[PDB]
Symmetry: T
Subunit: 149 residues, 12 copies
């Protein structure tokens, strides 16, 4: 149902923000500064997304996860500890991959909310998916690829 | 009931609601006086903007919104009570929460109705307003130490 | 009649006035639509804050202000008319000017009353409000091509 | 079978470009008592619908499409008609052309809402919903400027 | 007594008042710690600027304001108490309300005095300051669950 | 002399005053050039707003303010002197202070007149303006190392 | 006539111009009251800054600008008319446009003179001012439904 | 050729230029995507406002600017190419630099022409715009690792 | 040494921010709004502290933890999943407890950095400990207790 | 044995209060050519040292102390001398009193830096370091106003 | 001598000038310490931006600007003196005015040179810079009680 | 070497450093032109503030800072090179990183020296500046794809 999905996306968004901090810290290359501030922007944006999703889950009477243990236990986003220097394009491909994951899962949540008659969470997930899609186009354009490639 | 009648209905409901927000804004007393005072001012601004957007939307679809206190009291489904006997803060907050639940249910009915008639614009508008109303119900019900669905 | 009853009277008058300002804000049509639209928003904000300050001042002197639309309609001396048949821009501005003159005279009477009983605070407040209302009467009567005292 | 989303989005890119140029036409050639108010108003509308065009084009890019990027493609694919300014016109005439283009974009945007709702693209659906809301409000405002009902 | 002696007297009263506002600002404990903490900062700003305007106004009429703590303690009618044993929030708020009432009555006496000697400027100034003091008395007495005149 | 004639008189006085402020603004020379340059600009803005508000108030009471340099020179009681030989900073500041004293006394006469005829609005306005003028007299007389009376 | 005499001449012209802008600013009546009111204020600020910059430039080249209303009336070529009978909005706008044309032609003469004597600074300044004046002539002549030449 | 034909010609050139700026703004791919994306937005703002000022300046001198895409394509000397096959970042930047050089030379011709016919205003305007174009040519040619004149 | 301490405090600060979100979401009581915005302020502040600590660890050539697994494995701050409604005073006592923990550990880091001659990290930890001390006074004053009680 | 941190912090609370009142004294009774500049400057100094006093008192609360909160405690414990204004003084005189108080607070603040460094309270150490930095800069500025070296 | 060599010359002159502005900014003593302190900061910022724009303009025309202190000292025509024995405020201001006159004359020569070769961009830029420098010469020479051309 | 000599040494080092930052700011070419251009501007502002604070601190302790390019080149330990042959972006970034490492080591020596003499103020100042320098070394060494300690 909607509550399990919203909590699932809470965990996914927390792990996502931690990953955004990983790229924010370990990046090296010519595009260091631009993608550094860009990573800060992403941290703020997806943090606000996580806050709105969790408070929405509270609004519908649910209970969001509030510990790292619950996050790691329920998140479907994969995290990898940093062990050796990586290129900028690799970090951007991991970011784009997570963005595609959240795109698909958010779409499934849009269909689920549309069936269950929760138009609020439906519209919310629609807006979040819009921002995620725009970011997919931008970051896939950084890698010199089509948005559907 | 079609979309226009509902929009005017919510115009009256929102006006009476804002007047009530001023009632609590004025007659409140208690430990949480300042916080809920400025907070009531915030509610007045927010739902006043909601009322303006609803009325201008009703004008956009060629309707005619109610524009007098007589029409508001004649068509509103929100109950108002003149302040006579002193009331506690929790009482005023329970009246506020009650009206918020009323507007939540009615706004849901408006979302289904607009979804039926195919007016996606008013649908999305009522969706956003219902989002804000839900968040406020959670906040004020949490202030009273209660669950959002209680 | 004393100061408290007068302050409540002006609370009702100011509420009905703000509702009317929304009426013109919504139903106006003509070449000067945008200018008087934004201007009506400004008037709504200003006279709304006037109502808030008057009501909170009535609370400061230990009174109890009206807090429901029924009390407003029962105690207000400002007349409201539901919008039915289309009116011109100059007509709506003439109603606005009329209400402004009403609040001017009543506010003057309140200045005399507060000045007699020695309530200098409400005296100065009503003096400022009467200043703003006088300026608005000059401006809007100049819009209609008339003298401020005509 | 059914026309898809991308062709419609590009169509609205061209329509929005021609629209902005027309807004420049009224922005420059207007004369009358309401010169300043409708001048700054024309600037505001230009900013607003320019942002609409940019968002539509970037959304068309997001779904893997390619938006038109030349005046030739715009004039060849746009359904909004433009007229070069030759004889002096009144304020009401320019406002009637503006209102006409606004009604055109309103109807076409409605068709886009139905199409996006049909194909299941909820993002473009909501976006077109917002744009149609703004266009509806502007139709009410400018038709009220002409002393007319929003649906008249 | 004349205008200068009263204005300097209120300079001392306002200094002792601001110091007390810091006393509550520092030693307060309770559930309403943050709200009344920031509120105490606002009070410091307001009554401090009131003190500056009163002193510079006394300078404008050719007077000489007190400029040392000794003169303040020698001429102030506001009582200060060093903090020794812990007090509740309601106690500190009752002392604050007491000082606010003191300044209300004294400021009224200053309005009558300035009206008597014909200095209308200081009259209007004291009117505005007394207006703020009245509003604060209503708000803080509403925090204690009491009527503004009780 | 009634209120309208006085308000127009002060319109002319304020115009000539601002022109004089430009005279000092340009022909000043000395160590304190920058400070008194920006200060003269501040005075120009402030007294310009005073002149606009006074004239618009004169319109609010149904009067007709002077609107040409000829009428200003015809009714103004403030003296202007064309700049021919270089003057010191203290001289220009003494001319400024002198005009400030003139407007102080005349504005006080306006307070007595408006209070006598019962125009409380212009009374409060002129009270505020006289407050600002008094503060500026104290400031500039303190610049010259003199008591405000001064 | 050299550059200094021209700059002083335009100082007087700009002073009389701003005073006229206040004349229209106050005595205007009609449907477009608010728009042309704020617009007249904008013109007052803009041409006030032009007058300050022109006079300070005249000081920069070692000249001495006029600093009294008497000198302004003595050297200005812009005509002023005291307001006696009520005038329409189009009349005031035609006077404004007329003065704008006068300053346009004279400012062009100043461009030719400054370019001839080799003063490139005043050349560029007067070029910018003439640009603004030209744009305003187009705007206000478009308000009257006329071609800029128109 | 005269000033009006050149100004309209550059109106068309600037429109096609802004459309091309959107072409690169949308179809760009590479490591420098974000920096040159925001940079393309800045270019749109700058050259758009240049276009507005050029057109309104053409209006100020009594001309009639082009106001349709057909007139733009009929009179523009800037070449546009529909995007079909993918291009590199350096290619798009070389097309941008080419258009920038085109506008540089044409703008220089406009400076000579305006200086010839004696319109110093449009001369200075084209001087400023050409200054910006030169700075952008240096910056973007430095992006390609090339000399500004290469 | 300094690097191990800085990473340790990175984990502690991450778990801390997650806890601040827990109180931010599950709080109920009369002081709901004030402490809600206050919790937002704390999230921003300690997030900036964590960013500055991690980037400082990068400046001295260290490698900060960048996954929830590393955080949970190395953090010394205890987290508790929310299972039933709790009072405001309880949440404030947990917050104050974590603040005392970070106070003591930050003091130890000040002594360690002072011995090792790293005056930069020394001054940084001094400022952070100053803010933490002020917050301890404020929140302990909310509970009606002395700062040393 | 050794005097501790709390007594010093309270001492500086009283000193800072008396200092701010004195800054009000110069703020009001000043006359001279530099009236406006040193007037707004006196306001800036009042804000600055008021923030210093508030931070010192809240820091004293943070270490479990109790700051003085009455004028009686301030005058009884402050080491800064205040003088009621009786005869007119020049600008240089008021600036010499201000500079004197600034030097007093500089020296005492140095003693507080040594004491806090001794007892191991690094927080109050750094705070007093910042305050002493500001006081040093102001001593240089105001002694330069008097045409004197910062150490003269 | 051509345009590029002149632009580099003014780069060196502007760097040495900014360093001198810091010299007065640091070693000044006197009654006007604060005013000329902040003013020196303003001059440092302004003439620093002048240096940046001049150097980047030299880059735009394909030149190579000086980028080291050695090149600056070898090519600058502005004299610098290390501060050894104490100087008065008027002396430092006299050195500042002297350097301002130097940059005025050299900038004029650059206007003539750029005007001859047809570089209208650098011509207009140097015209603006000469305008600002002229204004500063008038202001600072007025500070010393002297005419701008004396 | 004591504290004053070190502070002056760092004044010279910081001035030569800022000049170098302008050198890279002007002569840079490559794909990362814009980002490192605005970034170089940021570095100029930051280290310029560092130089101002260091010099004013040296004045605070009674010292005399160097104030001429001759003194800077005579006492600075930072090497500058006039730009003759074209260099890559990575080369300029390696020179920048080298100078940053130089200032890091020297600032460390200053922290130890100030810690020895007991001047905690300059100690803390140099600590903050060294923090910023360390962060910048990490950032720019990460731009070059290198470890901060490489
Ligand atoms: Zn950002
Ligand atoms: Zn983003
Ligand atoms: Zn958050
Ligand atoms: Zn939140
Ligand atoms: Zn929240
Ligand atoms: Zn999943
Ligand atoms: Zn549904
Ligand atoms: Zn839907
Ligand atoms: Zn949405
Ligand atoms: Zn790549
Ligand atoms: Zn109904
Ligand atoms: Zn309670
Ligand atoms: Zn209120
Ligand atoms: Zn709020
Ligand atoms: Zn709310
Ligand atoms: Zn409204
Ligand atoms: Zn509205
Ligand atoms: Zn509206
Ligand atoms: Zn109902
Ligand atoms: Zn539908
Ligand atoms: Zn929506
Ligand atoms: Zn309760
Ligand atoms: Zn009309
Ligand atoms: Zn009309
Ligand atoms: Zn408005
Ligand atoms: Zn208004
Ligand atoms: Zn209200
Ligand atoms: Zn209120
Ligand atoms: Zn009644
Ligand atoms: Zn009545
Ligand atoms: Zn009419
Ligand atoms: Zn009466
Ligand atoms: Zn009309
Ligand atoms: Zn325009
Ligand atoms: Zn606008
Ligand atoms: Zn709009
Ligand atoms: Zn765009
Ligand atoms: Zn864009
Ligand atoms: Zn974009
Ligand atoms: Zn179509
Ligand atoms: Zn669907
Ligand atoms: Zn939506
Ligand atoms: Zn939407
Ligand atoms: Zn019409
Ligand atoms: Zn409680
Ligand atoms: Zn507040
Ligand atoms: Zn308050
Ligand atoms: Zn003060
Ligand atoms: Zn003051
Ligand atoms: Zn007494
Ligand atoms: Zn008393
Ligand atoms: Zn209680
Ligand atoms: Zn009275
Ligand atoms: Zn009287
Ligand atoms: Zn100022
Ligand atoms: Zn002033
Ligand atoms: Zn005005
Ligand atoms: Zn006005
Ligand atoms: Zn007005
Ligand atoms: Zn007279
Ligand atoms: Zn003197
Ligand atoms: Zn008043
Ligand atoms: Zn405007
Ligand atoms: Zn204008
Ligand atoms: Zn001026
Ligand atoms: Zn000026
Ligand atoms: Zn000036
Ligand atoms: Zn003449
Ligand atoms: Zn007309
Ligand atoms: Zn120019
Ligand atoms: Zn790359
Ligand atoms: Zn940018
Ligand atoms: Zn740009
Ligand atoms: Zn435009
Ligand atoms: Zn425009
Ligand atoms: Zn052509
Ligand atoms: Zn051509
Ligand atoms: Zn390349
Ligand atoms: Zn020329
Ligand atoms: Zn010519
Ligand atoms: Zn906050
Ligand atoms: Zn905080
Ligand atoms: Zn962060
Ligand atoms: Zn960061
Ligand atoms: Zn960072
Ligand atoms: Zn640990
Ligand atoms: Zn050490
Ligand atoms: Zn240390
Ligand atoms: Zn620190
Ligand atoms: Zn408790
Ligand atoms: Zn002097
Ligand atoms: Zn003051
Ligand atoms: Zn200041
Ligand atoms: Zn200061
Ligand atoms: Zn304080
Ligand atoms: Zn505080
Ligand atoms: Zn505090
Ligand atoms: Zn002591
Ligand atoms: Zn230690
Ligand atoms: Zn520190
Ligand atoms: Zn510190
Ligand atoms: Zn002296
Ligand atoms: Zn002096
Ligand atoms: Zn002097
Ligand atoms: Zn300044
Ligand atoms: Zn300057
Ligand atoms: Zn620079
Ligand atoms: Zn630069
Ligand atoms: Zn040379
Ligand atoms: Zn030379
Ligand atoms: Zn001198
Ligand atoms: Zn020559
Ligand atoms: Zn050395
Ligand atoms: Zn690359
Ligand atoms: Zn640059
Ligand atoms: Zn930046
Ligand atoms: Zn930086
Ligand atoms: Zn500096
Ligand atoms: Zn400085
Ligand atoms: Zn400084
Ligand atoms: Zn060295
Ligand atoms: Zn030591
Ligand atoms: Zn520090
Ligand atoms: Zn590289």
């Amino acid at each position: 149902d909607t509550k399990e999905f919203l909590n699932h996306q809470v965990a996914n968004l927390n792990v996502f923000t931690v990953k955004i901090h990983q790229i924010h810290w370990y990046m090296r290359g010519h595009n260091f500064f631009t993608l550094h501030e860009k990573m800060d922007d992403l941290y703020s944006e997806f943090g606000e997304q996580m806050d709105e999703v969790a408070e929405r889950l509270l609004a519908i009477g649910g209970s969001p996860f509030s510990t790292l243990k619950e996050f790691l236990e329920n998140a479907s986003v994969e995290e990898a500890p940093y062990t050796k220097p990586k290129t900028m394009d690799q970090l951007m491909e991991d970011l784009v991959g997570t963005l595609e994951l959240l795109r698909d899962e958010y779409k499934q949540g849009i269909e689920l909310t549309d069936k269950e008659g929760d138009d609020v969470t439906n519209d919310m997930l629609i807006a979040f998916k819009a921002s995620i899609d725009k970011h997919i186009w931008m970051f896939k354009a950084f890698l010199g690829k089509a948005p559907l490639e």
